């Protein structure tokens, strides 16, 4: 199986999972500690934003890759905004300071 930029999930804008569906392999929690141990911070950042939950940077990176330029402009993962909204749906107020 292989997967480039394809179909993404609905609630959290992440790539789908599976082979029947065109889905990307899960870079799980235990695989993130492996990139933290090396000190690979740009690789991890592109792993969890640029080809993941982040939406605008995901398309900007695709255009850059088919533009001759291998550079990322990451934003914020969508699943973190989902987490903030789900906390705010309780009686809890969570927000990002300035």
């Amino acid at each position: 199986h292989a997967r480039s930029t394809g179909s993404y999930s609905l609630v959290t804008q992440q790539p789908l999972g599976g082979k029947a569906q065109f889905g990307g392999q899960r870079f799980g929690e235990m695989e993130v500690w492996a990139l933290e141990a090396y000190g690979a911070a740009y690789t991890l950042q592109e792993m969890l934003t640029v080809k993941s939950d982040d939406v605008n940077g995901r398309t900007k990176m695709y255009k850059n890759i088919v533009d001759g330029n291998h550079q990322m402009e990451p934003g914020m993962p969508e699943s973190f905004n989902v987490l903030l909204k789900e906390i705010r749906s309780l009686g809890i107020n969570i927000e990002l300071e300035d």
């Binding site: 695989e31 492996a34 141990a37 690979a40 911070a41 792993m47 905004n81 987490l83 309780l90």
Partner: protein, 1358 residues
Amino acid sequence: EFDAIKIALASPDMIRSWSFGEVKKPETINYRTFKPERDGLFCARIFGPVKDYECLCGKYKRLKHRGVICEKCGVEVTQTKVRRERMGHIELASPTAHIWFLKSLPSRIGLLLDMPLRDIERVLYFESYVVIEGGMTNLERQQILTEEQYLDALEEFGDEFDAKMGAEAIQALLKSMDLEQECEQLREELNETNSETKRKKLTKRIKLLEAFVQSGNKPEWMILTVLPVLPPDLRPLVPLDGGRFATSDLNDLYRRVINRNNRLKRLLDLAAPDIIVRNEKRMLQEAVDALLDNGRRGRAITGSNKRPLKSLADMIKGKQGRFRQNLLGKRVDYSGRSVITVGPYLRLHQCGLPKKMALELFKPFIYGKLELRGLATTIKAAKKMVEREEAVVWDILDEVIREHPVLLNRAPTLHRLGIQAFEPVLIEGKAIQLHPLVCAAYNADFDGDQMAVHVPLTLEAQLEARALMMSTNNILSPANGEPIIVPSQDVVLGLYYMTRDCVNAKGEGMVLTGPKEAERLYRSGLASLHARVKVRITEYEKDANGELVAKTSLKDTTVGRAILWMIVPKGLPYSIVNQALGKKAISKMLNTCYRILGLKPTVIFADQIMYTGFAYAARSGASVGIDDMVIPEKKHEIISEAEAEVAEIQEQFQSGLVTAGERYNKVIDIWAAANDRVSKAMMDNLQTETVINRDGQEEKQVSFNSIYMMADSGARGSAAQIRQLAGMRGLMAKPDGSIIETPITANFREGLNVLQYFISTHGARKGLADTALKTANSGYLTRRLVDVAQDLVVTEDDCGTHEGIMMTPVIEGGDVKEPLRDRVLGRVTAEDVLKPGTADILVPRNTLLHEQWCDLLEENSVDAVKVRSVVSCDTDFGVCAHCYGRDLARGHIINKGEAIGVIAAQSIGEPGTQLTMRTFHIGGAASRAAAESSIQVKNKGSIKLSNVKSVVNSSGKLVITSRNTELKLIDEFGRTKESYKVPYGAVLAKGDGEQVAGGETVANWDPHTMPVITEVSGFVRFTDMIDGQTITRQTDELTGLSSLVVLDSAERTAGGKDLRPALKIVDAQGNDVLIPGTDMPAQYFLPGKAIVQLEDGVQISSGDTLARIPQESGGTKDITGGLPRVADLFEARRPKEPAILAEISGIVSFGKETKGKRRLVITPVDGSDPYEEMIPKWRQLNVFEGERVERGDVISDGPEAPHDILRLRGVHAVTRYIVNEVQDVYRLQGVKINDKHIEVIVRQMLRKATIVNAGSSDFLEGEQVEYSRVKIANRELEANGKVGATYSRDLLGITKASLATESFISAASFQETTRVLTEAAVAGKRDELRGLKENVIVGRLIPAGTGYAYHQDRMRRR
């Protein structure tokens, strides 16, 4: 953008500010033309447009009308992705209590209103009343009234006083309460009171009040007035095949809440009867509780077929929530997955990507170059060209895949070597060829496992893969400095068959002119590969300052070793291939090649070694037949001896010599001894069975048997597995851990019985159940080790400290398990070590001592080097490079900005997981020891006995009556060379300070049945032991002898629980004898399950056995049974019977007698003497009325709790204790872990420090605040004339030390999300995004590696 994340309670005004509307109808999409309802859970007016830039009614359809609000249906035209950013709200008819602040312990409402949880729970659910504003009557402000009491108070006190039930009354209580007045009243009461429980409760309530008053939170905000709703795009309704809709849980809960709210609102307008409206309010409360956190109340409501639907908390907490499933680990694009094959033609920096997989991974990269070269003009033309797979696409793929490394990751990524970067080599196929050297690192065989490919996109990612994650730069394990790309199981067989000799050849006496001549003779067939010839070899040496000086000689070698010498790089001595190379030998060869030459020669050497191992293993035909498993001719004689011994054991047991718990142990011991004797016999029959002529008469040599070859070479096998083929299989182990009573007396070359196979199946199923059912509690260990040490990185270069722990070789029962070199290699020392040419320094203070310095230290034979440790570092928020040591993955000091706390956690956490997933490779063998009974000193020297309280024997010898004694052997020089732990009640054939010949017994004892031997003589009286009550007694009337077994706490009666059975030694005249030197009578207690073969009132001698205690210590002793101990050490669990230590030094004496438990008073010579300790009657005391003790000395005996050690013997003692215990547990299994990682974990366990006195600082009296903040405040105050604050270090387990951190995001994402978020919301905490998990969750660069410089720039920018 942002720099902090603040969490707090949400006021109803703020909830209304969030909301863009008010959902007031329980109607989703109408199961029709897919449009939202009027004001339901989905609404274009409230939340947002369903379609992008299109009005719902059909009036505005384009971007030319952007921003306007329609009039027909009132929905503003905007981007449709605003349906996941605009929340709503529900105006509840009645107030409703938040379940998180009610049923999470401790209840915030409970200890804010000072009421028990039961009373407020009955008030909220309309089962009792609460007296608000009691007034001029006999009712208090928090009294609980039932229905009858409420009616009575209404009939006889029908004044303006009112008492309500439900959440409205609780909200009135919270709003009508003053916080500052209550806080000062509580402070007054706390200062007045003296009981510790009342003090703790009052200070907990004071802390809650201070957290409420300091933050902007209010008590009345914990009762919900308006309930916000999640945006619809975060709870979507996906239409299935047909007219139905998906079963959403949040929508169902919202519909229930809206139904209840609308029903209550309707009933509030028609003036319904009181019981009906109260029941409806209770139903609304239950619906809101089920929406917020379903299942925390009595019964979780279920949607369909009895399964509880997930609430707003079940999708934020747990393993399947937005924290561990979508934020700490995500699915990624540019990724692939396929099985793996060998492809041994590769190099260490190469892998094989299938030609049809790299085209789909590097697809945008192919698009870019196709548009650049002009073969396409748009993106669709290039997309179709790639889809068609034209002849020009493959050349573009070759051009874009040239130097673009990809990441190969196997499914369990235990350590950091599970992700590595390879330069792809396009192959035709569908399997990812993986280099055979990295299979050990991946722990990946080729029996059907798959690996995932990941494509680094950016230039920074490609350079991180090429410079950090490259498989070329991963030749050393990060846990220990041993090489990790080690040839395994075929290259070692090739190099062992090559570098070997037999005493004959095609040509043996010939003398050659070089290795090329040897290769030419082997290839031409004129000389065997195992000749013994003399080759002329020019070896180089860099003994100078990097100059290779040749030294040509004529050495007695073989042809195979000479052929192998052609690949050894220049600079290495010839005395590394001139031997029979196994796996350890060539692992050492690669290690010394890396330590001498560098990285590039080591990688080229590894590739050449793999090639020449595969070639010469192919050229040998090292098969395996059925005649290669040679059965020894004397196995059944050893079987007969052991079965006769077992028959004698049975006859002794049935007579009554031993019980049923000792027959088990002795039969296990005798069968394990017989199994080892059979294994030794078959190994001796295998290893040397090669009688071959020397060209004259017969001669002996090491065997060429294939089984023995691949067992001795270390290729694949050991003594156990090979023993089970030709010796005897032995005895199995059950899943519970118990060893099977009966052994199997057949091997896997003969058959097995229909019954022996059934017996073996117990161990076989144990081995397979252990992995799949108990690697969970070892993956849990590494997860909560990572989550406690994630935020530890190297932030400095040198803190400038002279402190540090002491390093000595560990000899704790045998020979040198780890010499000083292994424990001190690559760690910066703390003081100038003094050789035994004393008053002269050997090494400087701050030198990172490498292999040359270790050789220098071992030359002078040093025994103790004070080395700098992580736990003793003085840096704040991180460690320095010198206090950590060597990277252990490269041969230099650790770089600034390296996540060492994650490398430490992985290194500790995955020998356990890996070895508990590999427990079945030995099948189900018991793998237990033989229960060694005697001490045979092998070396020559004197003896030194430590902490011994011994007395005389009836034969005059010495008998040990001390628990923690150690028999250590000191040679003629004065250094310790051997050490042994002798047990209680063990006789001594020799004493202290006398030279012992090498190879004779010194201490003998029984491995089981520990005695209770005395020290004085006289008659013994059966004190406090009567038949039936405290002892089970059975009498042989023929002999008239009684053998009573004192029962344990289980079968002993409740009335006789305070009865303590013991043996008072008495003289002839009824007087109590005295322990020599003391005045305490010789009273000796007897624990449970103890048998006594003596009668009441029998004369004894000094130092003889009065009673026996069986040990029943039976276990398979794998890494599965043996790793709850590491979890206990890291979680700092107090043992059952803690050893009593001395809190304060001074003279020890007793005062008052029998306060239920004994009283001991310690009085120093100069200072204050306020200390008294309550010692229970359980354990005796090793100190007496007139001795001198120091803090940390043991008043009693038992396992030391790792908190008394911290608070008495200091930080160094507790960290050394934890390191030694964990290292012993791991070393029992052969695991090799450097102690830097355990020291890092201990340091992460040591971050809290309770204040003792406030001083001039701003801290409180007994607050638990982080030690780094205390050190910063004290160092800042001591700069001025102010006095600092005295503290006390605390030790928390890896769970508590991670759940009690300053960042609520890490704690919430680790465990107990509801409990962490509730406390964070109440206290109004503000996260600073300081760790690694926080930046991973947020979506930034970790402040660990290449992002460390960027984070330093950002931090110093503001």
